[PDB]
Amino acid sequence: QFRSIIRIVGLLLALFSVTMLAPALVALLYRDGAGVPFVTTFFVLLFCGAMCWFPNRRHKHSRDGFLIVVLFWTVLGSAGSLPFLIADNPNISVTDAFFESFSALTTTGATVIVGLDELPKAILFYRQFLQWFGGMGIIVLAVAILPVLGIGGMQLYRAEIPGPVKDTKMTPRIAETAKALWYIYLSLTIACAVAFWLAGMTPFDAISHSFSTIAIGGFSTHDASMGYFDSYAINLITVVFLLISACNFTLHFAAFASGGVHPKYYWKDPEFRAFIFIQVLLFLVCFLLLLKHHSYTSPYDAFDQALFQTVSISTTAGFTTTGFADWPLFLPVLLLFSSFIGGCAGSTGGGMKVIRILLLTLQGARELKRLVHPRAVYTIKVGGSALPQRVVDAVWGFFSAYALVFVVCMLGLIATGMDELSAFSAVAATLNNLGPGLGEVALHFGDVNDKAKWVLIVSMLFGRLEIFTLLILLTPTFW
Amino acid sequence: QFRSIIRIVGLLLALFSVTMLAPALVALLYRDGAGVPFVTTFFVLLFCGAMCWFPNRRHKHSRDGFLIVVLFWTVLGSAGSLPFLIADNPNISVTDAFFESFSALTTTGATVIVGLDELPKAILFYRQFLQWFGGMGIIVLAVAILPVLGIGGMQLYRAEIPGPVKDTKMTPRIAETAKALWYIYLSLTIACAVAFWLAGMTPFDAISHSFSTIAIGGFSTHDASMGYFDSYAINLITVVFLLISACNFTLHFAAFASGGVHPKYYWKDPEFRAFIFIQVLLFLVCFLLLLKHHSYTSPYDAFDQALFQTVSISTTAGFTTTGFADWPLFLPVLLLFSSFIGGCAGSTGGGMKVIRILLLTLQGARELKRLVHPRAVYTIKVGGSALPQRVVDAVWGFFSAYALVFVVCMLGLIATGMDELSAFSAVAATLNNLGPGLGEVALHFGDVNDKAKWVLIVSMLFGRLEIFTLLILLTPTFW
Amino acid sequence: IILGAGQVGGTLAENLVGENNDITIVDNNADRLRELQDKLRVVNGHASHPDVLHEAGAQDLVAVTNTDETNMAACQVAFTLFNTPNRVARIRSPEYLAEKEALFKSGAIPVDHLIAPEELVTSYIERLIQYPGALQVVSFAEQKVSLVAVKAYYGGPLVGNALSALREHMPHIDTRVAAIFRQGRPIRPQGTTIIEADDEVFFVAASNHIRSVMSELQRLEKPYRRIMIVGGGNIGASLAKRLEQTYSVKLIERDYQRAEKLSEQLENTIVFCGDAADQELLTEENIDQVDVFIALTNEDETNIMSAMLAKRMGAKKVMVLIQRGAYVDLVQGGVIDVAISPQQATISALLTHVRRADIVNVSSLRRGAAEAIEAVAHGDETTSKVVGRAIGDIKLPPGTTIGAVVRGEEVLIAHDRTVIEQDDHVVMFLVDKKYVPDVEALFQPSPF
Amino acid sequence: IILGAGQVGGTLAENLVGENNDITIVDNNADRLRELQDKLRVVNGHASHPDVLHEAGAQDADMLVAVTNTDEMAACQVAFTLFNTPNRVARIRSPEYLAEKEALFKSGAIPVDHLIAPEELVTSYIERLIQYPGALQVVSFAEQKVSLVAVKAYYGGPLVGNALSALREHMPHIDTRVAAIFRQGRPIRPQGTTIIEADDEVFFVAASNHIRSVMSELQRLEKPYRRIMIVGGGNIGASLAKRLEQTYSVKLIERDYQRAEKLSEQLENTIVFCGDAADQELLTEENIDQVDVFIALTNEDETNIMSAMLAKRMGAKKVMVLIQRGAYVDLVQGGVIDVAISPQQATISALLTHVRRADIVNVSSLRRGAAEAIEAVAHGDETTSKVVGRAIGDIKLPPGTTIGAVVRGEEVLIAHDRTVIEQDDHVVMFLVDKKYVPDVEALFQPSPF
Numbered sequence A, B: 001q002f003r004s005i006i007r008i009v010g011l012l013l014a015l016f017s018v019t020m021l022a023p024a025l026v027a028l029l030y031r032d033g034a035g036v037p038f039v040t041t042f043f044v045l046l047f048c049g050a051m052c053w054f055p056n057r058r059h060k061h062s063r064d065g066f067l068i069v070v071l072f073w074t075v076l077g078s079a080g081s082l083p084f085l086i087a088d089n090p091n092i093s094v095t096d097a098f099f100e101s102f103s104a105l106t107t108t109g110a111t112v113i114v115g116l117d118e119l120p121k122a123i124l125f126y127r128q129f130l131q132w133f134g135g136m137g138i139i140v141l142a143v144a145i146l147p148v149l150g151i152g153g154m155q156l157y158r159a160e161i162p163g164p165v166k167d168t169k170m171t172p173r174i175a176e177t178a179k180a181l182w183y184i185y186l187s188l189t190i191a192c193a194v195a196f197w198l199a200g201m202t203p204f205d206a207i208s209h210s211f212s213t214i215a216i217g218g219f220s221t222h223d224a225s226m227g228y229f230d231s232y233a234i235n236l237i238t239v240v241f242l243l244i245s246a247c248n249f250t251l252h253f254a255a256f257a258s259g260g261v262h263p264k265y266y267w268k269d270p271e272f273r274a275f276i277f278i279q280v281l282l283f284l285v286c287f288l289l290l291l292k293h294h295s296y297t298s299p300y301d302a303f304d305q306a307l308f309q310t311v312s313i314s315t316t317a318g319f320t321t322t323g324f325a326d327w328p329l330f331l332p333v334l335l336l337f338s339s340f341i342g343g344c345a346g347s348t349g350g351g352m353k354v355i356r357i358l359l360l361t362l363q364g365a366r367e368l369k370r371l372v373h374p375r376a377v378y379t380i381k382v383g384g385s386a387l388p389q390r391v392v393d394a395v396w397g398f399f400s401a402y403a404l405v406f407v408v409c410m411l412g413l414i415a416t417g418m419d420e421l422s423a424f425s426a427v428a429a430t431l432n433n434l435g436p437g438l439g440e441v442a443l444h445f446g447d448v449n450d451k452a453k454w455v456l457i458v459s460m461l462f463g464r465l466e467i468f469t470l471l472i473l474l475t476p477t478f479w
Numbered sequence C: 001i002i003l004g005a006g007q008v009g010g011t012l013a014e015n016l017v018g019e020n021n022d023i024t025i026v027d028n029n030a031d032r033l034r035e036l037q038d039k040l041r042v043v044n045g046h047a048s049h050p051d052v053l054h055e056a057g058a059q060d061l062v063a064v065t066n067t068d069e070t071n072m073a074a075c076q077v078a079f080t081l082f083n084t085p086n087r088v089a090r091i092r093s094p095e096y097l098a099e100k101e102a103l104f105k106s107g108a109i110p111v112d113h114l115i116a117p118e119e120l121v122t123s124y125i126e127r128l129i130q131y132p133g134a135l136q137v138v139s140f141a142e143q144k145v146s147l148v149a150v151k152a153y154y155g156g157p158l159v160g161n162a163l164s165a166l167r168e169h170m171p172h173i174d175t176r177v178a179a180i181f182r183q184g185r186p187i188r189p190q191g192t193t194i195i196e197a198d199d200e201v202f203f204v205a206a207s208n209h210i211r212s213v214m215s216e217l218q219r220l221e222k223p224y225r226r227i228m229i230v231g232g233g234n235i236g237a238s239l240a241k242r243l244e245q246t247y248s249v250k251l252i253e254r255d256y257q258r259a260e261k262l263s264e265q266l267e268n269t270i271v272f273c274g275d276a277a278d279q280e281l282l283t284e285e286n287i288d289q290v291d292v293f294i295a296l297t298n299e300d301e302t303n304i305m306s307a308m309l310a311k312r313m314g315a316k317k318v319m320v321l322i323q324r325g326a327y328v329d330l331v332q333g334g335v336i337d338v339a340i341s342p343q344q345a346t347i348s349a350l351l352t353h354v355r356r357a358d359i360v361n362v363s364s365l366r367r368g369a370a371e372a373i374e375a376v377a378h379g380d381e382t383t384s385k386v387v388g389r390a391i392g393d394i395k396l397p398p399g400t401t402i403g404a405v406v407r408g409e410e411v412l413i414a415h416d417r418t419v420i421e422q423d424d425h426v427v428m429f430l431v432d433k434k435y436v437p438d439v440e441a442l443f444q445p446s447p448f
Numbered sequence D: 001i002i003l004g005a006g007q008v009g010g011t012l013a014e015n016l017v018g019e020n021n022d023i024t025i026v027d028n029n030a031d032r033l034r035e036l037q038d039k040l041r042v043v044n045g046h047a048s049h050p051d052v053l054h055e056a057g058a059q060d061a062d063m064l065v066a067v068t069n070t071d072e073m074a075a076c077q078v079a080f081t082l083f084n085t086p087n088r089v090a091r092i093r094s095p096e097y098l099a100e101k102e103a104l105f106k107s108g109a110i111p112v113d114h115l116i117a118p119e120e121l122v123t124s125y126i127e128r129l130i131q132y133p134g135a136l137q138v139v140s141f142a143e144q145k146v147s148l149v150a151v152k153a154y155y156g157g158p159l160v161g162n163a164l165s166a167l168r169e170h171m172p173h174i175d176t177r178v179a180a181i182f183r184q185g186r187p188i189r190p191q192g193t194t195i196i197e198a199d200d201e202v203f204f205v206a207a208s209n210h211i212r213s214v215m216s217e218l219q220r221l222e223k224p225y226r227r228i229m230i231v232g233g234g235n236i237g238a239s240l241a242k243r244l245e246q247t248y249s250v251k252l253i254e255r256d257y258q259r260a261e262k263l264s265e266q267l268e269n270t271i272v273f274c275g276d277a278a279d280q281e282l283l284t285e286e287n288i289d290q291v292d293v294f295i296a297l298t299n300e301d302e303t304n305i306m307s308a309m310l311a312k313r314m315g316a317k318k319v320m321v322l323i324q325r326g327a328y329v330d331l332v333q334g335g336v337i338d339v340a341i342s343p344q345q346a347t348i349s350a351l352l353t354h355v356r357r358a359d360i361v362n363v364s365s366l367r368r369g370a371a372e373a374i375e376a377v378a379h380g381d382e383t384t385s386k387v388v389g390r391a392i393g394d395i396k397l398p399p400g401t402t403i404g405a406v407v408r409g410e411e412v413l414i415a416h417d418r419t420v421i422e423q424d425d426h427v428v429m430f431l432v433d434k435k436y437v438p439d440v441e442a443l444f445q446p447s448p449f
């Protein structure tokens, strides 16, 4: 068992090193930057990645799959910290680095570096590049390797969910989902990237912010996310390229199968039909509360600021184009609760994907009807045919595990000296892969304690892996 | 439909007035008190209770049952406010009174009267008496009328409980649970009451604190609950008379059926087998954290203080014999989370009874096992026979509704000007029926805003009624 | 050419033969066949084998087996190797309907006309709900004319009143009593007859304006709102899929695994799991507010002992589904308001294809010896005994009474002063059916 | 396209795929389908409705094979009516669809291009063994001309312990060659060093025309069978009786009276009985000690064995069973029970002669375990083929494979080390391990033209 596994591990470490070249290339095409740690890392990882799989080139073939994917992020996440440790320009500690490594790779977006505006333009590419890499990682995993495992959380995910709509063939897996999905990934990143150029900003900010919106990360090369240029176009592009990137990519497979027959594939999927209503009702109510409060002078800005914040926080994107200055205290909290309703399943997204919430709202009302008609027979409507009792169980055990981790991770941050409010603001921001602390203009992750940043890493994985993937690691039955 | 309902209402209003006499009797037996409002109320209610059912003496016979029990507390709770409005000795607002009326009757224990030590000894009996009345109310409803409705919270409960243990002579669905349970109720109140007399305190405080501890209660005639006399005996009696009074009363039905054959009935009930372990593990961990912290000079005090606080907060009792001065901030938070696991079902009880948590932990681990053995068949162990899929759903829809109300009731307290932390400290204290605010710095419910003091009333009902009972009221299917 | 000696084949074999038309029935059940051979020529047959089917057809189609699949083969064997005309074949199993358009409007299968029983009864049941207060609705070959039956009680506008006493006013749209069923046996309407209590008064009405007729007689009660069903089978699900959009439906199915699919197939319906006689379920689910309690099960005994209970609790109305059609009058009336038969509706549709262009069309109102018929008058006054002659001047056989005349698309109610014109579709009520080839010989044109 | 994932569809789905041909199977049974998906495109199918059938196939276009639960055809017509897909093969079991095949099928009414009637194939096969006494199994290839005949080596046999080549020094009249040797259930490929031990399945090669001649030259053609006994009254039992009562003295044993009467009506010159198979009295009372073969054709394979085991104990000269599932045959064969027959190793035997038609390899009827005999076709002159002109002894065949014969047009050349393979030959060889086919399929196959 472990033998062929380390083959996979050292194999990926090599592939990660090949990624290190592209940043340093920028640190030579540009020379506002420091490239040596990337080339120092490229070598040391290639060795340490090669040293493990050479004596382990022996090939052999569920218990296998859970232990791979916790290594896919544990190993790659640790390796991601190395460039930051070496370079003296950030002057970043080890835990601050492991955090920024994981926060980047996990597509979280929670940063611990102050004043990154003037940081070198070489380390500034690597942060956004790691979000891109973890952006692709979730897609191949969520659509392909993960559903087989049994924690798919993609439409009617449970174990058997073999491509969903227009699922023809599908015999090759991961490998026929890593190749085909890349085209959507690349054709979506470039489209926004040149769109930002058409908005007007520099190539770097145009591109390295495309790696971030598409991967639903929330990073930036500026301390303020999209307040650097308070232009409706950039916001309206960042809004539309988060809504497009948040929905099921197996529904974005409605373009590579005999051309553009989109609307039938999209609208007949109940997850996308609920992604819109939840997204509209959010911004709709987050707008009426701004107009009644006169938080912004002209209702165009209020429209701009609101319609971006609800769709940058409830899609788990984590971009802040405001300071919630004129916003009621009661608005950042509501937006933070909306973070749990992350992007649609099968996409780069947050914790309880729309279906988990959709299934939860569906089932929770059925239990309200049966209270009056006990002898009636009720079913769930989501798809064409009602769900198997396995899936309904697989959502309600997921909510339980979620609010089991979220409480242990909270009484673990409290002990390290934080306060009740900041803990909630932190774990809800990291378990959901959000990033920004939220609340009444609060969390700055530099202030966080050393032994809390570890717990935060512990948590942001829990959200990125479907919580069970790592929760079963400490079970007696698995071992 | 509505007609025979109002017959029941006016009938109980009359019965409530008959209760008003016992307070006023004390305001003349005792020499410190004001009796006119109780006797002013006795008359006006008897009229207003009689005026409704005289033209409605027409008798006629599920939709009936839900609307009765929300009136059972709405009507009686409002009526409870009347004595406080009239009496000028505690000149107190209307909403402060409705709150103290509901908080008493709902057995919450959250008070809004400052310095009640020197308040008259007549209003001091009425507050504790209302807890006694709501103490009896929950028992007759939880074990008899409520299970039939559809929300049980009673071992296996969905709507099919013959009590399981000694399921004999159950013909009168409520007429022999109100009669038989009263003897257990009275035989429990007197035992502790004279026990407090043997502890040494005055008859009044001896008795009117038994009304408070036998029912889930939480009230006091002193601002500090049981710090008035920091004597181990009173604590060690209040501890054992909360553990004995907190669990299933149909297990206290192991004394009225052919004498004292207790231990088999008690220990073979899995709810009591988990009530002990949850109670022990709490105090055990709340003890080692006090000993490691040297919060108290001698481990007898630490033992006294801890073993009382874990069993006064996890049972929903609400008694504070300390100020958590030397306690870590991290202890009042953990204890507040333990408030959800209140007393065993079918008894004066907390927000999610032991089974709801027991069923939740059982089912949540099955979802962890199935992840590795997908093709295996798993079942639930709690009782003799595994549970029907109806009950497992009725726990997991109850968790959802709980964290649906608790979030809506929270963003409703935030808007009225409170802060995120104090709202959480309030609704978790009222939804669970635990009076204390429970933080290092407590919430003192006088400071609560007027509009919030309504939402708290709205909330403490939600916890006292099984949350669904009132949640279906606003459904379209019910009307 | 038929392939059945069942209630369909037997009722046809009895109804269709007046020497007007000639046929040959096929059945492997000898004791039933030569019994049904009384009621013409009988070809003993095995399945749809060409020897029996194909040889009988040319030089010497209706296919009513137990199964649909055997029936389809027979129409193809007759269409492939001889190219036989018409071809009506009953098909019951729903999926052959669900893809009927794909299959049948592609011409693949050779059914010229379908008789889908589950569809016909369920459309019929919806036809009664639409006109509240109607016991039975009668359909003829001509869609334009139709009879509507009502129930006369104490306190009704029609009890004890003289028939002609109602004929003195012709208000707005008009009616006429074509038949009167009482105590199970038939009373033909006369001027001397009085409408006693608990009668089946069969009014005539143009199919377009039926509701208008019943409201002018003050019998159109409030529209039904709340419906209750009891069958989860082919008729129960079809009816639910038709009523959940317009009426508040409740269903009761006692087989869970089937109760689940009904929860999937029916979006806006409440399906249950219970036995029909479960008093708790009927009380718990507010049956004292039910307006009609359709029972659509397999066993006629169960429908009655449950639809009798629902009236007792009680519902506003009740309907059963007596599977064999031979007892419709016996169970009907009294406690159970309405009784429906699929084999008095399946056969009702078959007698509109067979009789096409013929002298008589046998109505859906066949019960016992009485049956309503529609006779066609061909030829001008020179080649017909019955054309031009006023209705009151036709020496009709005993018990027969003309109720209406259909001329093109307009319904003329029969009055004694009416003239029968050429190519008319006359609607009349026979108390005794042994007289048809007398009528069939009266209206039929003399040689041309 | 295969409309089944059963033992037929699964055995095909494994055998036919060498990337030489591409197919798509249909099945509503997921656990068995994605199991059969190992062996390839799956189109799970709701009762053969058109959306499955034509879209899975007719748009892509490929041969249609339907083997699902029942006979009632509908799917082949759905493929023929609105799509016009060609070369449709559909299994049909129920006799009435066979008994009137001429009226129905030679009128072109039903669209079956080729039939696979299992009762017909098995019953014809059993008569083919009876005809050559002493033959355990007869192997049929795609080419009717060549066929293998298997015998059993005992103590006192002319073939025990003798050296293989020691028989190759004389070539008397018509000649043979040992293409396979099965012993103890596991396969031994023939070599010069191999010795014929006792209780072996020595598979001789023989031209289909002269099989009896081969067996009499090896002194193994015993006296023709005279008295036969059967035990099944079902579709195969009656068919076999209706075929043997004219040439052999038949007795039948049927345990359902109402069926025993029709067997008395349908069989004019046969004696059918009413009894249980293990009724010792009936077997003795009806002279079983003079039975020459005791065919057992029941529903339960357990019953066939436990009765055919009884009726060699009593005295039958031979015994035959019918192990219904075909994956078992070599495990009960030999020893006490002489012969075991499988319908699902014969239904599949005919399907791999239509599917493989004109292809590089034809999979023989001799598939048992991993071993299978195959027939490979050599196309192209010496310029576009590795295997043409090269002598048999000079071909670097994959391990375990050994050529046994060569079929040329209409004449069978026994493989000798000194033989030359000419163009458009049908080479017959024995694979000990079936994982090597796309090696052979790549060796014989002509290079690009």
Ligand SMILES: Nc1ncnc2c1ncn2[C@@H]1O[C@H](COP(=O)(O)OP(=O)(O)OP(O)(O)=S)[C@@H](O)[C@H]1O
Pocket (backbone or CB within 6 Å): C003, C004, C005, C006, C007, C008, C009, C026, C027, C028, C029, C045, C046, C047, C048, C064, C065, C066, C067, C343
């Ligand atoms: N193989 C067959 N070939 C011909 N007729 C068959 C065959 N099997 C059954 N039947 C018919 O089965 C019929 C009796 O059953 P059914 O008619 O199906 O019952 P039924 O349909 O409720 O009665 P009906 O509707 O009035 S015909 C007879 O008409 C038989 O001829």
Ligand SMILES: Nc1ncnc2c1ncn2[C@@H]1O[C@H](COP(=O)(O)OP(=O)(O)OP(O)(O)=S)[C@@H](O)[C@H]1O
Pocket (backbone or CB within 6 Å): C118, C230, C231, C232, C233, C234, C235, C236, C252, C253, C254, C255, C258, C274, C275, C276, C296, C297, C298, C302, C323
């Ligand atoms: N006693 C009963 N009470 C209520 N429902 C019943 C009862 N008996 C049977 N049913 C229901 O009726 C069904 C019978 O349907 P099927 O026999 O499959 O088709 P079908 O309903 O008989 O066809 P029709 O059109 O109703 S005659 C059962 O499967 C149940 O759904």
Ligand SMILES: Nc1ncnc2c1ncn2[C@@H]1O[C@H](COP(=O)(O)OP(=O)(O)OP(O)(O)=S)[C@@H](O)[C@H]1O
Pocket (backbone or CB within 6 Å): D003, D004, D005, D006, D007, D008, D009, D026, D027, D028, D029, D032, D045, D046, D047, D048, D067, D068, D069, D344
């Ligand atoms: N009603 C049906 N419609 C379509 N496919 C079916 C149906 N019933 C079974 N099948 C398919 O046929 C297979 C099951 O058929 P079986 O009952 O095993 O037939 P079979 O006799 O076992 O076939 P063989 O000769 O033994 S391999 C599965 O692959 C199913 O997908």
Ligand SMILES: Nc1ncnc2c1ncn2[C@@H]1O[C@H](COP(=O)(O)OP(=O)(O)OP(O)(O)=S)[C@@H](O)[C@H]1O
Pocket (backbone or CB within 6 Å): D231, D232, D233, D234, D235, D236, D237, D253, D254, D255, D256, D259, D275, D276, D277, D278, D297, D298, D299, D300, D303
């Ligand atoms: N000992 C026996 N046990 C079981 N069946 C027996 C036995 N002896 C004779 N039979 C006959 O075997 C018949 C089985 O026939 P079927 O059920 O139609 O299966 P079948 O496939 O038609 O028969 P086959 O395959 O042609 S041998 C039984 O009905 C009996 O008539």
